[PDB]
Amino acid sequence: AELTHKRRLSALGPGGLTRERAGFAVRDIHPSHYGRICPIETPEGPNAGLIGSLATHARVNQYGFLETPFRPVENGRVRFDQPAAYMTADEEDDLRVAPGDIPVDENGYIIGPQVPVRYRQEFSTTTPEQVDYVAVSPVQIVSVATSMIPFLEHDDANRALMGSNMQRQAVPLLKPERPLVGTGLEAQGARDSGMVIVSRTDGDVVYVDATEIRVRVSGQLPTASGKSTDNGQLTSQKGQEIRYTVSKYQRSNQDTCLNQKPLVRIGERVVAGQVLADGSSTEGGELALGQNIVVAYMPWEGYNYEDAILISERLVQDDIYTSIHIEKYEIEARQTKLGPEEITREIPNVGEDALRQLDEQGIIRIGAWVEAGDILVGKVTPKGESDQPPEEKLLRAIFGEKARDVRDNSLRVPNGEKGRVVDVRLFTREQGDELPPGANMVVRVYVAQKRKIQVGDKMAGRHGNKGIISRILPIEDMPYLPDGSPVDIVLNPLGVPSRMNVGQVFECLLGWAGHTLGVRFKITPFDEMYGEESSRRIVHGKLQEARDETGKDWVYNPDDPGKIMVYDGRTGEAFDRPVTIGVAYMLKLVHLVDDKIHARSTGPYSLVTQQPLGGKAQQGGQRFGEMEVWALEAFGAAYTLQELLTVKSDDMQGRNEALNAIVKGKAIPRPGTPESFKVLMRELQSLGLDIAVHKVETQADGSSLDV
Amino acid sequence: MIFRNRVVDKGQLRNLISWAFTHYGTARTAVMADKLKDLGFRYATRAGVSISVDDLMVPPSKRSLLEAAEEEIRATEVRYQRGEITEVERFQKVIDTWNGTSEALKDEVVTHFKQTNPLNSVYMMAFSGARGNISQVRQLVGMRGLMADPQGEIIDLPIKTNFREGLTVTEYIISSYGARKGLVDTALRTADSGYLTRRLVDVSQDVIIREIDCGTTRGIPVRPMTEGSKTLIKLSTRLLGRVVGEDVIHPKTKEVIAPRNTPISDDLAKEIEKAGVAEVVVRSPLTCEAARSVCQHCYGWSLAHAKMVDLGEAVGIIAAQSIGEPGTQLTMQQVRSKMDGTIKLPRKLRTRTHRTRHGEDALFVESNGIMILEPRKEGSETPAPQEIHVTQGSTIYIVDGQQVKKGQLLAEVALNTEKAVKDVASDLAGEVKFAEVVPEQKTDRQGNT
Amino acid sequence: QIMHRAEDLISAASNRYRITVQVANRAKRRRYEEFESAEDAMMKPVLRAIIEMSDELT
């Protein structure tokens, strides 16, 4: 998600457009983008098209156009030797330009006298001789998460759109494993994140505890071919501040955690640009976004019926798919012109989860389980009184409790959180004093959280496979496999429909080959230079041979390719139709169930307009817009409508006393008029009106007016 | 109690249900519906049913059909370069040929599956009842035909393959193009709809049934909707659940159906379709008196349950949502009736070649006539299949540009022609020199230049 | 059964509105009157109301 958010580029912005003021054909693939802007790539929302990212190879000239690397084909034949051709900053090189997907004769020559080419923004049947330019590769115009698709070549675009994106949203995990079948192109990608740690220079590791690699400030062969050649200003030889640290669990812009275990051994030999420890979710020093598990394609009743996914229990039992998340929580104290308000250990009305898991200032100890209502940090407030109902004075009297005076806005974990506490970060005059003008302490506190997978999580493949968990099956009920190895997801078979993402079976299969062969394999979209699908007879091929390296036999069945038998756990049988099977690389997605859950019996209202305060964090409320009401009055008996319009949103008093009225145990009373009416009066009235809402009563019919 | 031996999946259960409905409660049906989905699932499972690139058969003569089309183009250009024939011309067909093949494929494939698949997926789900469509199953194996460029130019060379083969780049791009366009659109017509309704509902907001009294006996006629001999709508349905201004009178070869005010239930329809009536007159709230609303009686059944509306219901806003919605999915053959050829009556169809020129060639205008509606092409005088005379333009996927090869573009079948200009770019670097025609000068037919 | 009753109820009565409401108020009374008589936690006064209006009344 970084990269692609750096090399993002954008059209909007001051100097640019607006969404509105610019419409459509200004969002399209002007055929010059070719090679320069991954067309596959875009939010949507309105912004489609307004936000592209950068092709892979592109880059820009100091004027700020995108010189496009190519290859000079002489007599219609690239000599290859050429270090590409960094020209063509604009698409009008005007020339024979070849699309970097060419059946190319070994040794230069092109092969087909029907090689297309763009030209003046046109494609054009060309011949091999009279041609200039070939693309460096057939996968340059695309960008990150797009040119990475295992078997791109084989899918709908847009779907692959989705793909890309999903890829950007995969949370990172405890140890995201390098996938199985990958496009080659990534090691790099990782590497340039700068979320990993890279042989700055050179040296043969020495001391490496899990927080740094003193192969660095230690001073031996690491740090010391971090003495081989010895930088301009830098710590040219010694144990050098090539003391890279390495950092554990810091929060992310998504609350995700990151960390880089030493990874490297000790006493050994690294050269610059190599890579030392690993970022969040990268693995062998290379990208690794999610994992890879064995999947089957069948129509599991109900769960999986449609856009639903099953799952074994081992899935997260092996700790796969669980991630971290951690958490900011700050809170602060502040001179009321009543006073300060504070931070005590002490607060009224306490005992367990209060004045218990609490420090002398009512903070927490690092590393404390907490739960959903307990105290983060306790502080009170100069509440006093100066406004009370006699009935309160009573109830004193009876207890004659000379009540206290201090609201007590402790800080409590809200609900649905867990999880150890990592830290705190107090901020006052002495503690940095980073706070609003007049605040005293600020406190941060950080709380983390494993989370296993669990029903309810967008979770998808690298091919727009948006799916949601529904049931988890205890492992001893899934159809397992002929070898009894319980499979464990089970998507819906019928594929490549509107998604047109057949590409993904291809690789499942494949995976499975390198899963049975137990060997990773890189690849690239557009397996051309082959009259036939090419990818198709690879993969078979591999399988094929995968049998016999273990002779397992059911590894590959030419008849019904890669279909297998399957029993099923619950009772113990396959069926008339063998089902494919593969491993496959899935990936789990940030927006997690808890990220969207809500409820409100009732809570805080609005200011002006008192209708519950619906905004997402905090007890919000579902807004019933016109079209929604167009589903109510369109129905039959619509009291509800009514009331819904009021007592659960506005007759103020109405609200309450309803509430009550149920607490009483009976029905509720007739409503009144909502507010926002009354408001409207006001405005209008405040604008040269004489509103007479008014009755016409008596036999003498009586015209009045009202509040 | 009617045992029914039939392959049930999509539609079989659809009308079933209804049937139930009428004849039993809802409640029951529901609980039916249920029990049976429940089947559905569990069997499905039990069958076990997967798909794969291999499962994506290929229709063998994929091949011929195809490269034939190719050599087509060879002729095309033959004279094209040779300036017997030329660019807007031969090219407005190096185009059509493709999309004719496209049908040709459309056929070979389905036809094929139609005669294969012993309960195979593409027959157990697709072809029968499931997300499988054809549309996308065409190019799940078929060859994409031409498509277009960002805007509406149909790019020349079609999208030759499908997704096994996987594209090669260019396409890949092209393909994109589309998809983007599709996209941004979407991003728009979203609103556009919602917008409507919102009007609709506004304009049609409170025609509430107020009132059974009403009055009047006039209505309105109806008749199946019948573009060409294609009759869009079995009158039948169209009758559903209205009230019969007067007596639906069969050819008096029978006697009197449905007097009057007769909420016209289906059965009654389906039959009195099949007493051949032709129109009938049906208390149209387009008339009938009911204050600021439609006569409860002159309204008729409420499709909410196929039973007359209740009362005091704002049918207006309701008639708005109904319309409104689907609006959204305004996208703006199969069962091998024959093959990739369609409604070819007896022998013949007529078009334009000047912007095609490569000899016997052509893009498209309309078609005429003689609609026996049975394999021969277009004419009278009977074909092989089903012999009853008819007459009129006939949708025939395989359209025109003669089969320089396998078909000159079909998948725009048409049972507003403004101008454009012939590139005659320098086809080489040399001493241009025209003659045998030299440009009869003017400022009449071109203008003044 | 209550379900079929609920159906029959309004499968042969006045405006489906008209009914309800009178089912309603009824139960309202069924709740107001007999206030928390038999717990009713299960047979909601509304439910009562329905059955005693879809079978008892019928």
Partner: peptide, 21 residues
């Protein structure tokens, strides 16, 4: 009528307005 009763709270030409009426 309707659309106001809503705007406004009270209920609808139908409902009790159609029952009591």
């Amino acid at each position: 009528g309707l659309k106001e009763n809503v705007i406004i709270g009270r209920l609808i030409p139908a409902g009790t307005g159609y029952n009591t009426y």
